[PDB]
Amino acid sequence: TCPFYKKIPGTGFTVDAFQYGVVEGCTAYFLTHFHSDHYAGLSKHFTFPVYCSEITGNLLKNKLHVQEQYIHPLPLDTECIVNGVKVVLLDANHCPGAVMILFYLPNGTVILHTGDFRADPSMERSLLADQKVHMLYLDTTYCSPEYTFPSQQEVIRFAINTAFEAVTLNPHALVVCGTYSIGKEKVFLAIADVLGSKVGMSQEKYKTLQCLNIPEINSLITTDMCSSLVHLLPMMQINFKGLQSHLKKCGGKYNQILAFRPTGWTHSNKFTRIADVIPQTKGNISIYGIPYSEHSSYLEMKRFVQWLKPQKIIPTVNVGTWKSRSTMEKYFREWKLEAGY
């Protein structure tokens, strides 16, 4: 049954709650972003109102075939009225089309649901600064102090320099980048840009990217693999067997693969600096794991919450074990005591 942390009190609303069947007394289903754990259960047969960003609405219509009459896209940073309740969508700095939702309840409570986010100081100057928030439903994916990682900018710098060096030394090398959902587009796009190539990909992936309103996308992506030296593959295929196989398919156009797997976190971060990262190599294949995250680090999350000073925090991630839940609640108390709220 629908967990409490997907329900907005004082409304008929749910958030990312599409896998429970008909939620009893839900008059509007919000979807924060197009990732499978959050959209699971949507299809062409869904007949209730879905509220989302324009980009998420493009993906609903074109990838899952949800009918147009049930998609209610809302513009960002704009006061809107839904079943008599004022709401605002804000940029979550997650994947394309991902939002946070501000709800202004009739009784005067103000709730922020972050959906999935990577906290950023830029948020401290949006519509959030203009009023107080009583309840925060928080993306706690990496809510433990061992989760440190570099800025997205330092990681893209490392990838571009690595790729440019490799292909300049060997103009017959192929670069491969893994993907399994929308998000992290900058990795493969920035590499293609420095090399003067388009990114080659499957028809289904090309379709997904064309839903995202990315400026100048017809210039950066293609389905013609033959004309490209940056290929996008499913993440699962980013291993020595999958890559040896792919290289065979290219028919002696290329004699080396440099591949990138942008993971969330990996334990090498506690010990290693981005400058200090090395690939796994076998034969003429090298694989780099790079810590490109689209979730808050522990310190980025902590800053955001200590700025916002909510009266109550409701975690939405890692809530399934008692030891996790208990540890998170202890961090929230430290933060409140340190900041004085």
Q: Cβ 143 to Ni ion, closest distance in Å?
A: 15
Binding of residue 205 to Ni ion (CB under 5 A)? no
- Specify the residue, 116 or 300, whose C-beta has the smaller distance to Ni ion: 116
Q: Which window, 31-39, 73-81, 185-193, 240-248, contacts Ni ion (CB under 5 A)?
A: 31-39
Among 327, 325, 341, residue whose Cα is nearest residue 134: 341
- Specify the residue, 55 or 257, whose C-beta has the smaller distance to Ni ion: 55
Q: Cβ 194 to Ni ion, closest distance in Å?
A: 28
CB atoms within 10 A of CB 53: 23
Binding of residue 116 to Ni ion (CB under 5 A)? yes
Binding of residue 184 to Ni ion (CB under 5 A)? no
Binding of residue 35 to Ni ion (CB under 5 A)? yes
d(CA 174, CA 252): 11
Q: Which window, 111-119, 166-174, 252-260, 275-283, contacts Ni ion (CB under 5 A)?
A: 111-119
Q: Cβ 172 to Ni ion, closest distance in Å?
A: 37
Cα Rg, the chain, nearest whole Å: 22
Binding of residue 185 to Ni ion (CB under 5 A)? no
d(CA 202, CA 218): 15
Q: Cβ 113 to Ni ion, closest distance in Å?
A: 13
Q: Cβ 32 to Ni ion, closest distance in Å?
A: 8
- Specify the residue, 54 or 193, whose C-beta has the smaller distance to Ni ion: 54
Q: Which window, 34-42, 139-147, 172-180, 186-194, contacts Ni ion (CB under 5 A)?
A: 34-42
Q: Give the number of residues in contact with Ni ion, rule: CB under 5 A.
A: 2
- 257 and 285 in contact (C-beta within 8 Å)? yes
Q: Which window, 27-35, 77-85, 190-198, 235-243, contacts Ni ion (CB under 5 A)?
A: 27-35
Q: Which window, 32-40, 128-136, 141-149, 210-218, contacts Ni ion (CB under 5 A)?
A: 32-40
Q: Cβ 264 to Ni ion, closest distance in Å?
A: 10
The amino acid at 252: G
Q: Cβ 33 to Ni ion, closest distance in Å?
A: 6
- Specify the residue, 136 or 294, whose C-beta has the smaller distance to Ni ion: 294
Q: Which window, 115-123, 201-209, 265-273, 317-325, contacts Ni ion (CB under 5 A)?
A: 115-123
- Specify the residue, 96 or 242, whose C-beta has the smaller distance to Ni ion: 96
- Specify the residue, 138 or 173, whose C-beta has the smaller distance to Ni ion: 138
- Specify the residue, 184 or 198, whose C-beta has the smaller distance to Ni ion: 184
Binding site for Ni ion (CB under 5 A): 35, 116
